UniProtKB/Swiss-Prot annotation, chain B:
Homodimer. Inhibited by mannose 6-phosphate, fructose 1-phosphate and fructose 1,6-bisphosphate. Its activity is also inhibited by Cobalt (II) ions < EDTA < nickel (II) ions < zinc (II) ions << cadmium (II) ions < copper (II) ions. Sodium and potassium ions and manganese ions show little or no effect on activity. Its cofactor is Fe cation. It is found in: Cytoplasm. Keywords: Cytoplasm, Gluconeogenesis, Glycolysis, Iron, Isomerase, Metal-binding. This is Glucose-6-phosphate isomerase. PANTHER family: CUPIN TYPE-2 DOMAIN-CONTAINING PROTEIN, OXALATE-BINDING PROTEIN. Binds 1 Fe cation per subunit. The gene is pgiA. It holds the Pfam family GPI. Pathway: Carbohydrate degradation; glycolysis; D-glyceraldehyde 3-phosphate and glycerone phosphate from D-glucose: step 2/4. Belongs to the archaeal-type GPI family. GO terms for biological process: gluconeogenesis; glycolytic process. It comes from the Archaea.
Length: 183, 187
């Protein structure tokens, strides 16, 4: 039997005790933002951190659960808001649940058949990501966007699909939050 | 097959209420034989039969890979000197885990393996508790204010209340000049 445990989550910083921390800078997201020059330019300026993750994951096993907070920093590549790489689940059939804790943003989701959805998130918002949907989180404000994600331990990852095909929409700013088609 | 639609629902940090969730209510009368002091229990039922806890749940069909979530508002109180608590259970599919996230108040979680090996983990706002596969678990309110938390669990986890209703937990959590976890006499 594995040992149960309790770890503290800091509502102000999003940091979880004993969690495994990972960092993703702009340089780690080549080809993700539509404006390549804005990207190359910002990177040369010492690619700032786009987001950090504090995760507690179990072995890949059916019925078990993983959890992690993400600190999505505010910013834009051109006029495209800072975002996570996003992905599909290796075992696409797994769902996910997000709980927004600080700041504001939204989640962009997509199905293999072409459907795309954008769900706005503010502190207290719980987003249910159904099985089969690819998803990415977006920070649409000027402050850090912090959220806790809970997902099946055997969900796995699938960035390739998005790495190539990607999402059918991009979220940018036109004096206001705008969701438009992607190329 | 249709693809279910994603959605966002608002959770109120102060009340524990989740918009569009299904509400369930458990009063002291719904927990017959759960507390050790049967006389204090019956006396409290007659005096008013207070609500022990309310649940606001958003559940999916019992399918593998899916997820359910629910908040619980566990009210403060004691039956004799035993703190208000949830009924407790093992998952129907015993190897499913669960994750708890405390939001308001103060309490703790009592867990035990099928054999009776127990653990007690304190919970305060911000505390995340990992309920591993195979462990039964029960939440306890050790404070004077409502203990509110969010639970996330597999849609096919299910609930085995029966085993706990029959044998209870190996330990009980009470107040004796302080919070104490001791052996459950009728365990
Ligand atoms: Fe459960």
């Amino acid at each position: 039997y594995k040992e149960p445990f309790g770890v503290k989550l800091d509502f102000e910083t999003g940091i979880i005790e004993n969690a495994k921390k990972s960092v993703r800078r702009l340089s780690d997201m080549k080809g993700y933002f539509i404006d390549e020059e804005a990207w190359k330019k910002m990177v040369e300026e010492g690619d700032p951190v786009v987001y950090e993750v504090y995760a507690i994951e179990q072995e890949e096993k059916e019925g078990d659960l993983n959890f992690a907070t993400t600190v999505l920093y505010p910013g834009k590549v051109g006029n495209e808001f800072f975002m996570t790489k996003g992905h599909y689940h290796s075992k696409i059939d797994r769902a996910e649940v997000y709980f927004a804790l600080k700041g504001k943003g939204g989640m962009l989701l997509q199905t293999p058949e072409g459907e795309a959805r954008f769900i706005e998130m503010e502190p207290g918002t719980i987003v249910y990501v159904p099985p089969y949907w690819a998803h990415r989180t977006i920070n649409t404000g000027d402050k850090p966007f912090i959220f806790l994600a809970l997902y099946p331990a055997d969900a796995g990852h699938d960035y390739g699909t998005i790495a190539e095909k990607g999402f059918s929409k991009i979220v940018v700013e036109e004096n206001g939050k705008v969701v438009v088609k992607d190329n």
